């Protein structure tokens, strides 16, 4: 008789994995013992299609950080997680002064210390994050670009003047909370090709669902 599970909040709860940073010792990948991750909630595959059910949305995100070595090991290493709000400058190097700009919230924690966890508010200067924008910002490559949907960047790095002694891997989970949505719309039935637009494969246009032989046979 109850329908608590079919609510928006119920549907979008759960902290999913949306990011993974690699900080190897020897490597082509993030060679300066640091990394910048612009917040992308599409990071959880399944996500995109779920949110793209609505035209507008609003919510808060709870971020939880999981860090270990590639084998999932724990070591005595301290870390800095920096959140650079949109409009704030991300660090270009492992010594950029951005790391010390008070206006960039930062949180420190040892790998041993349990997961780091913080809540981030509804940033957008607009009244709601909008997944679809039918226009351009005052044939073009700026089509469908609602920038005021930026949540910010997360800069991660080993604390200290020198490179870390261990190879590290950070995982970022994100639980969406206090959700409100407007204007529902057709469930994506075609495969996604790009993170930006809704473009699809005009050759590989598949029928929404399983087909059959005749309309008289089951």
């Amino acid at each position: 008789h109850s329908t608590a599970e079919t609510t928006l909040d119920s549907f979008f709860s759960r902290a999913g994995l949306v990011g993974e940073i690699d900080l190897p010792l020897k490597g082509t990948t993030n060679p300066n013992g640091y990394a910048n991750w612009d917040i992308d909630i599409t990071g959880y595959a399944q996500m995109r299609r779920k949110v793209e059910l609505f035209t507008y949305m609003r919510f808060d995100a709870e971020f939880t950080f999981v860090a270990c070595t590639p084998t999932g090991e724990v070591v005595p290493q301290l870390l800095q997680y920096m959140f650079v709000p949109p409009g704030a400058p991300k660090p270009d190097s492992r010594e950029s002064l951005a790391w010390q700009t008070a206006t960039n919230p930062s949180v420190f924690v040892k790998l041993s210390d349990p997961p780091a966890q913080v809540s981030v508010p509804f940033m957008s200067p607009a009244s709601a994050y909008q997944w679809f924008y039918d226009g351009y910002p005052t044939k073009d490559l700026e089509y469908g670009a609602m920038p005021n949907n930026m949540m910010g960047t997360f800069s991660v790095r080993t604390v200290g003047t020198s490179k870390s002694k261990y190879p590290l891997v950070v995982r970022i989970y994100m639980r969406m909370k206090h959700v409100r949505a407007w204007i529902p719309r057709p469930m994506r039935n075609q495969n996604y090709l790009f993170k930006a637009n809704p473009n699809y494969a005009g050759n590989s246009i598949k029928p929404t669902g399983a087909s059959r032989t005749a309309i008289t046979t089951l």
Binding site: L8, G16, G43, A45, P105, P114, A126, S127, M187, Y192
Partner: protein
């Protein structure tokens, strides 16, 4: 200080624990929510919306995909002939996948409620005739012929009188668990069946096309429900 003993589960990270965490920007006052039309609050609102049911889910040829939306009736079909058939399986493959209901059932594991299919005749205004639409509850095998289906819960539809008709499916329940291959799937079995027979033939005067199509629209009653969030999809965000 104040005496305390830490209990198991201390320091653990539950991906579903809905506790509170520290606000990164304590002073920030997020831009106020203003009024926006059509806010959705509970998915079951969507489930009660009529979506086109691709009963005719047979053509796959890219340029004939629009054909899945409508099936047809013609003069050529003789009295009694079976026009079409399908099951009352919202979540399983087939016709229901096209409806919004179907797609939402996919993000859930269990469900139950009364459904409701509406048929729309889109033929010429001059055409007339009768179609028998029968429902065979779960278990009952598709009726042999029109007459045997005539004894079951049926509805004679005269599109000469009313261009629309809505059928109610009393009940469907995806609750019976199944562990086939080695992958456990909470499946139907309640495959209720909806058959449609040409009670009379398609009658038309000179000047009117001898074929017309019909559109299936389905939704669930207000007594519908779903349980167990289950994210599943073939479409995902590409690299």
């Amino acid at each position: 200080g104040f005496p305390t003993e830490l209990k198991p589960g201390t320091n653990q990270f539950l991906t579903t624990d809905d506790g509170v965490s520290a606000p990164i920007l304590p002073n920030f006052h997020p831009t106020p929510c203003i009024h926006i039309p059509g806010e959705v609050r509970n998915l079951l609102e969507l489930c009660q919306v009529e979506t086109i049911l691709e009963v005719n889910n047979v053509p796959t040829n890219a340029t004939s995909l629009m054909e899945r939306l409508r099936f047809p009736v013609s003069a050529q079909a003789g009295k009694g002939e079976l026009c079409a058939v399908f099951r009352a399986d919202p979540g399983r493959n087939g016709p229901w996948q096209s409806t919004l209901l179907g797609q939402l059932c996919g993000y859930y594991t269990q469900w139950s409620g009364s459904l409701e299919v509406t048929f729309m005749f889109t033929g010429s205004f001059m055409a007339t005739g009768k179609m028998l639409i029968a429902y065979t509850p779960p278990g009952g095998p598709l009726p042999k012929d029109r007459a045997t289906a005539m004894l079951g819960t049926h509805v004679i539809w005269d599109f000469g009188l009313q261009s629309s008709v809505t059928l109610v499916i009393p009940w469907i329940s995806n609750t019976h668990y199944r562990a086939h291959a080695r992958d456990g799937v909470f499946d139907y079995y309640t495959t209720g069946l909806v058959s449609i027979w040409y009670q009379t033939n398609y009658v038309v005067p000179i000047g009117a096309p001898n074929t017309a199509y019909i559109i299936a629209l389905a939704a669930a009653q207000k007594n519908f429900t779903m349980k167990l969030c289950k994210d599943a999809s073939d479409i995902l965000q590409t690299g």
